[PDB]
Amino acid sequence: KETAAAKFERQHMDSSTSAASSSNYCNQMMKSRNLTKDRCKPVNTFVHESLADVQAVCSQKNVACKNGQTNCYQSYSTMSITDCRETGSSKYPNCAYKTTQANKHAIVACEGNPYVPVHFDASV
Numbered sequence: 001k002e003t004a005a006a007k008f009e010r011q012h013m014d015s016s017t018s019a020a021s022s023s024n025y026c027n028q029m030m031k032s033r034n035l036t037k038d039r040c041k042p043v044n045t046f047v048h049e050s051l052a053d054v055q056a057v058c059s060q061k062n063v064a065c066k067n068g069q070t071n072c073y074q075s076y077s078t079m080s081i082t083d084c085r086e087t088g089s090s091k092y093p094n095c096a097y098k099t100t101q102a103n104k105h106a107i108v109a110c111e112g113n114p115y116v117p118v119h120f121d122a123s124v
């Protein structure tokens, strides 16, 4: 079993790099974080900030989530973010992703005590 907090860290946290290096970034990252083990994760986002900074977003701007839940938070400043999406020629187990790097505000859902990110809603 894996806690929600831990799953968010695995799926969305990447403080090792300051941004998406190349176009293959999303390919090897979706792999190293085990997001291609049993299925190709269609869409996934990586935040290139310190965990501390991402966790802090749980105390930033409270916004609604796409699903309507009122526990989403948007970061006051922009963050280095990498979006990963399957390309047209992506088929399990040969997943292929388009890596798109940018700096936008991250929006996550927080819950529990300690109150930390447990899901990544979107990035604006």
Ligand SMILES: [Cl-]
Pocket: 043, 044, 045, 120
């Ligand atoms: Cl995501």
Ligand SMILES: [Cl-]
Pocket: none
């Ligand atoms: Cl600060």
